């Protein structure tokens, strides 16, 4: 029954879910200073050309675009993977106001939103099995700013209105998630957690440090989603995202000088 808000927040996750004050959770602060570049990582590889996207669904936390993974589509490889991770979903964590919303921070700095591209390690042979292992999952993470507009975040944008509530979903097909990704692939990357309970301690983090921009009427519809069902009392889908949590020694390594 959880959710973001005073009774059901973050701070009370760790009740069901005691991972929650675990060794490897995430988001963390960025500390760009203590980051150290990696020069043995190899260049981060994106190949998102046969992405093949299903629906969309409001889980009641935020809307996840979910792939066709049954085959050897959208794979990131490299940087600080071994072998070859194939993309599930995306989703986003977004703030009320422009001046919150993203979950990783860098030196404290938070940006409007947080994109998570999500990928399970394909020598596990399926997500579910891969949040079994402590390198089932790799998470490619992207800030979003306010200011020009995405245009390849428009398509999602326009089918929010039909996903307002809970549990609502739309088949959402042909979506390209290479309109999403800013031009760089510098990243910092560190061992952690979902975001989200159950918390579980599967991800490699690579978090881009570049955002992308979109647009302020284009967040704002982002917040017009709600939390709650349909046929229920409005709460406006804001500030779904999880605050820092204590970096417990774990090093993050930087893919640039
Ligand atoms: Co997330």
Same mark, same amino acid.
């Given at each position: ?8 927040? &973050? ?7 005691? /991972? ?9 602060? /960025? ?9 043995? @990582?190899?260049?981060?590889? %994106? ?5 093949? =996207? ?24 490299? *940087? &600080? +993977?071994?072998?070859?991770?194939? +993309? /599930? ?27 998570? +591209? ?12 891969? %949040? ?8 490619? *993470?992207?800030? @979003? ?34 309109? +999403? ?10 061992? *952690?957690?979902?975001?989200?309970? &159950? ?19 284009? %967040? ?22 999880? &605050? ?10 930087? =893919?640039?000088?």
């Amino acid at each position: 029954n959880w959710g973001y808000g005073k009774h059901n927040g &973050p701070e009370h996750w760790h009740k069901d879910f005691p /991972i929650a004050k675990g060794e490897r959770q995430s988001p963390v602060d /960025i500390d760009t200073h203590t980051a150290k570049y990696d020069p043995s @990582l190899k260049p981060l590889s %994106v190949s998102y050309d046969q992405a093949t =996207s299903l629906r969309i669904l409001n889980n009641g936390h935020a809307f996840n675009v979910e792939f066709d993974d049954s085959q050897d589509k959208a794979v990131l490889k490299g *940087g &600080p +993977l071994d072998g070859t991770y194939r +993309l /599930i979903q995306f989703h986003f964590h977004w703030g009320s106001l422009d001046g919150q919303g993203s979950e990783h921070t860098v030196d404290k700095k938070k940006y409007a939103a947080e994109l998570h +591209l999500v990928h399970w390690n394909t020598k596990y042979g399926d997500f579910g099995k891969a %949040v079994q292992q402590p390198d089932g999952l790799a998470v490619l *993470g992207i800030f @979003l700013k306010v200011g020009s507009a995405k245009p390849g975040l428009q398509k999602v944008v326009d089918v929010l209105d039909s996903i307002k509530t809970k549990g609502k979903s739309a088949d959402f097909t042909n979506f390209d998630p290479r309109g +999403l990704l800013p031009e760089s692939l510098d990243y910092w990357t560190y061992p *952690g957690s979902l975001t989200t309970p &159950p918390l579980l301690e599967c991800v490699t983090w690579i978090v881009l440090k570049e955002p992308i921009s979109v647009s302020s009427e284009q %967040v704002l519809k982002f917040r017009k989603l709600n939390f709650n069902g349909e046929g229920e009392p409005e709460e406006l889908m804001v500030d779904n995202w999880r &605050p820092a949590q204590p970096l417990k020694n774990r090093q993050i390594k930087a =893919s640039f000088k």
